[PDB]
Amino acid sequence: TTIVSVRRNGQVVVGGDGQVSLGNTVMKGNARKVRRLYNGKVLAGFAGGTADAFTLFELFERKLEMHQGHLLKSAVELAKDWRTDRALRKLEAMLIVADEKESLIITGIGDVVQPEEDQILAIGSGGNYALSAARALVENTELSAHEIVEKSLRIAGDICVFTNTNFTIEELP
Amino acid sequence: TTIVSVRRNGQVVVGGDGQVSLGNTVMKGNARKVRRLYNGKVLAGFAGGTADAFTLFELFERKLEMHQGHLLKSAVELAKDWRTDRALRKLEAMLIVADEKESLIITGIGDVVQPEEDQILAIGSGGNYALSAARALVENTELSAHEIVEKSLRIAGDICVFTNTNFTIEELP
Amino acid sequence: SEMTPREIVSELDQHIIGQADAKRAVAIALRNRWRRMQLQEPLRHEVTPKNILMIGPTGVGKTEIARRLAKLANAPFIKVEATKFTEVGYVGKEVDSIIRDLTDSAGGAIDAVEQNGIVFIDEIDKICKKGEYSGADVSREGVQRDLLPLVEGSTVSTKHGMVKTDHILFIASGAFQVARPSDLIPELQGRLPIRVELTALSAADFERILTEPHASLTEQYKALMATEGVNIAFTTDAVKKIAEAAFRVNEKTENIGARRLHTVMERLMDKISFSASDMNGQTVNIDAAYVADALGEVVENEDLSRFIL
Amino acid sequence: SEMTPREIVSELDQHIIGQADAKRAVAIALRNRWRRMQLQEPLRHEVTPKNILMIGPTGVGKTEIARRLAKLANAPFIKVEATKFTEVGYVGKEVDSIIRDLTDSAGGAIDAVEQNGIVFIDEIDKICKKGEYSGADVSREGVQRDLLPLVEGSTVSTKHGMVKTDHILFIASGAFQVARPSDLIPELQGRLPIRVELTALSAADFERILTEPHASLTEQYKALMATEGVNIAFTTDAVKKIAEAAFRVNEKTENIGARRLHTVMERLMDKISFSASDMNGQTVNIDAAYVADALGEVVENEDLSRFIL
Amino acid sequence: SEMTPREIVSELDQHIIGQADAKRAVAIALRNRWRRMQLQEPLRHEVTPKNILMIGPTGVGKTEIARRLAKLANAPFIKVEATKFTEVGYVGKEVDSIIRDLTDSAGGAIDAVEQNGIVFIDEIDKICKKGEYSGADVSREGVQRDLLPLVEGSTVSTKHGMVKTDHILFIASGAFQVARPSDLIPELQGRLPIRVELTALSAADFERILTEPHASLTEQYKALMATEGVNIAFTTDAVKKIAEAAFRVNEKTENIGARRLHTVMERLMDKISFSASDMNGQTVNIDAAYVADALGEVVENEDLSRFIL
């Protein structure tokens, strides 16, 4: 799995592959690993255990709902459930969430992290492959955030055996 | 164990082998790994731990009963019991369920997955062997869904040591 | 002296559609009140009621039948939810309270309660051993144990005096979709001799529930609007669409039985109910078109793939 | 004999801004009290209330509407929090207590309570099955079970006598941000026929709540200060800033709806409220500048990165 | 007719040192009792109290202010600890009991309680969501839910009759060292409009609490010894050392606020309090030296490295 997000020119994109693999064999190549939350105004992409990912996703959605859908605050409250005595079971998955304001990556262990400057996030086995292609594309091109995402995902896919070419790209106008 | 399902021409089939093996020794070769649920209007085939499989099966049946027997909704509610804090123990088994509308595979870890296009599912150690023979048979033949299932199971059986030739094929008129 | 089983069924037929078996079974039970009581001292006390178990889906009539029957027999009546006794902590949360509540609803008439009181124990299939999520199972087995005394015959103290439960008729119910009646405890199982099945309701039945029964929904709305000086009339086609829609959503979403008719009618009589005061003297014709407009189009989505991979 | 649905809405419009759908729905319900009661013996008892479910955010009017309505109909009224019945241990912690409390607030007038009592069950979305942190879920499902008897029609004993709940109107509410109404139990779902949606309040609405309603906050403070011999007046611009500030903090921090107006006014009338006694004979003009000074600048931070890596 | 906000503050200044903001806030609240009540039927009922939240450390005056205020207004008063309602099992352990207790302390005077009763809910910051050691959190959220009815306006039954809580003034408190007021539930948050901060007490303040307030500790001991025929006098220097010592141990060990003064005085008046009967006619001068002797040297150790590696 590969998920990457780029934010430039007042545009936010988050896309990912579609390959679902059981061991060293593929099961499905058309999975949607990026979806819209909170009245379709926040982008979310997940990686890791198929079940753990969905539960991390779902848990986060409940949060957005208990707040005015504020990405940051929500991320922080969800992560707080891991920073207590009640050892809330950990999930072997990761999420990339974004909207018109910020972009974050949240993990099933309980921590939130923000970009760096070029507003680029990437998770999954193929993450760092799309990450490089994107950093490169951003510091040397004028390509749209939507173009960078598709181009980097493809690259990543040609390197990682668990990342295919069936993308699902969501952008927030 | 090998279980495969094909859906074509308004016909749905789900069949499987009969070999039950303890370690590298066979115990029984006439097991029925495919059975009918909800007033015999939904097909279900299981693979994995003998006990875990039956409990996954049973748990699913209770679901169909608490709903109007809707395959999808049922699958989603059962899977939801794994996507919460109460770490509902995981089962080392898998189910293939189908009816006049859809076909799904459900796992003891908590996720539901749908086919791809050719409406073909397969689980178990011998799964991918029957899977190929079936994809092949479907994209190059006019054979019935019932014929494809029997032919692919046989093939799978001649390759996997844990898959025999004592089939149990159920189809939904 | 009293109605016969054939007469009682006809009385019930005026309020209930279908469910012949359940109707028949309670008519026999009510008639036996009259049969004994015609007996002499010895037997009159030895002969006891043959309690009933009605198995059947949601909102298909199980309670209306029990309720109507008590009504036509002017018998002290009471309905309670099996589960309400899961756990206890004070007087009122004990099964014995069923008898006090019944005696209180009849103004203390002890002879009345003992002779022909009726107790409807709803959702008894809930206090069994279903699913693995059985946290406090001893609790459910427990209430079954608590009912035994009542159904087997005992005396409970009420602020009105002592009351025997030896001749009170007991009717229990359930859908038993996961549990079976054989799951109840032997003692209870043997005290619920008669098991009647009630079936789901089809659209054809829906259509009849809409108009045939005394004080049907169509008759109620006709009289309600007549109050505001409006004259309404449902066409055969209109009734048929209201029933299809009701049966339709019970099937695609949550099935609540004949209650769905109430939900749909309300969604249909929405407009007229508001403007009735401004339409005096007029007459409204609710036909096919009026219904297709009022009942918009297909409830609301069918989403669910949001959780699927 | 009684107001019409159009009249009732106008009566509510004097105290509530927006929420046309909810207003309309309760007017229809109140008018039906009058419609039946004009009926004859048979139907008059068979026709029952069509209870309501108001879905909507915090402090946007769901209770004011219910409360005002009962007021204009002089109907025994009562509000309770669904969750208050989570767990029980004594008499007063049982749902039945809702009816005793209602009867007690009307001085025992049994005919009054039965004929037109109103019960507002707040936050019913809380007793569903939301989130994974569901410790005692059987408990929440349980209170739903406990309400059924009441909403379906039964009798409860009060120190004033027996009271039927067959015709009491029930209004439930919720934001249902995580749960859906379809999550309630079938029996309850079918007894809450009508579902009305209430929307969030914008700044434009805030501005109107400030002055239009009878006894608005601006009218209250004018009368309060007049008591101390001070004459105050809010300019259009002033009102507009008070509403922007209120809508502003509900949006950046915790959203409490129209209650925020109270918080802001207090923060604004802080000074005058203290010095009013020393300013007799004077007149104060609360304009834009006065408001921008009083309401300082941006609530307080927005920190949160303290937990981020 | 009644005191003004400036007058009330002066009345409080005779018993409390510092805490101008809190004093000011409660004076405004008490004056509003008088402001409405000068209003006419419509508004007089619509205008409600603006409840208070006093945030501040231990023993710095939060209760004395509330207590003194009720005293100067001869208002039925009551203090309760938020946590006391964590879990319930019987009548008296329910929030409603706050109103019965209040009515009982005024001899049933219902008009009195409704018009100007005051309820001080101490340590409300304890029923929030603080620390991870949150075992029964639903419990704490629960009492917040239980207070809502009271603060929002309702009726509770007492053996003296029914009593409305619509106009009772509510004052809550907390140190909120870990929790914030924003942690309370929206409904409660909006009903505690006013938030006043109370500060810690310095040695300079300690010195003033010792003598300035009516019936200060120095005035009490002077009168107590005068009873035994002894005449005592504290020098300015003596007072200053007593205050330094008090502020000193609150700082190095456990900080209990102005209560520490009581602990220190007792440790100081130890000897004279015992021999007073044998010293009649004499006069004792408590000066710097007398205090340095009586108050020995540095509380007791500071050990703690016993657990360190």
Ligand SMILES: Nc1ncnc2c1ncn2[C@@H]1O[C@H](COP(=O)(O)OP(=O)(O)O)[C@@H](O)[C@H]1O
């Ligand atoms: N067979 C039927 N004929 C007429 N009305 C019915 C029938 N079944 C259900 N209803 C109506 O539907 C509503 C639900 O009745 P209920 O007796 O509680 O069904 P159940 O006992 O299965 O829960 C009632 O108001 C009743 O009038």
Ligand SMILES: Nc1ncnc2c1ncn2[C@@H]1O[C@H](COP(=O)(O)OP(=O)(O)O)[C@@H](O)[C@H]1O
């Ligand atoms: N639409 C509205 N119009 C006028 N006042 C409103 C409105 N909505 C809320 N309020 C005010 O805000 C406060 C909160 O009312 P509330 O009925 O409890 O909202 P809700 O029922 O959603 O919790 C009340 O004092 C009420 O006067």
Ligand SMILES: Nc1ncnc2c1ncn2[C@@H]1O[C@H](COP(=O)(O)OP(=O)(O)O)[C@@H](O)[C@H]1O
């Ligand atoms: N600012 C103050 N001025 C005079 N006395 C005070 C002051 N603060 C606290 N005290 C005294 O200290 C004791 C503790 O009072 P308390 O009101 O319970 O503080 P808090 O409300 O913060 O817990 C009381 O006997 C009171 O007389």
Ligand SMILES: [Mg+2]
């Ligand atoms: Mg690849």
Ligand SMILES: [Mg+2]
């Ligand atoms: Mg083999």
Ligand SMILES: [Mg+2]
């Ligand atoms: Mg039922």
Ligand SMILES: [Mg+2]
């Ligand atoms: Mg049911």
Ligand SMILES: [Mg+2]
């Ligand atoms: Mg509310």
Ligand SMILES: [Mg+2]
């Ligand atoms: Mg709320």
Ligand SMILES: [Mg+2]
């Ligand atoms: Mg204190």
Ligand SMILES: [Mg+2]
């Ligand atoms: Mg303390």
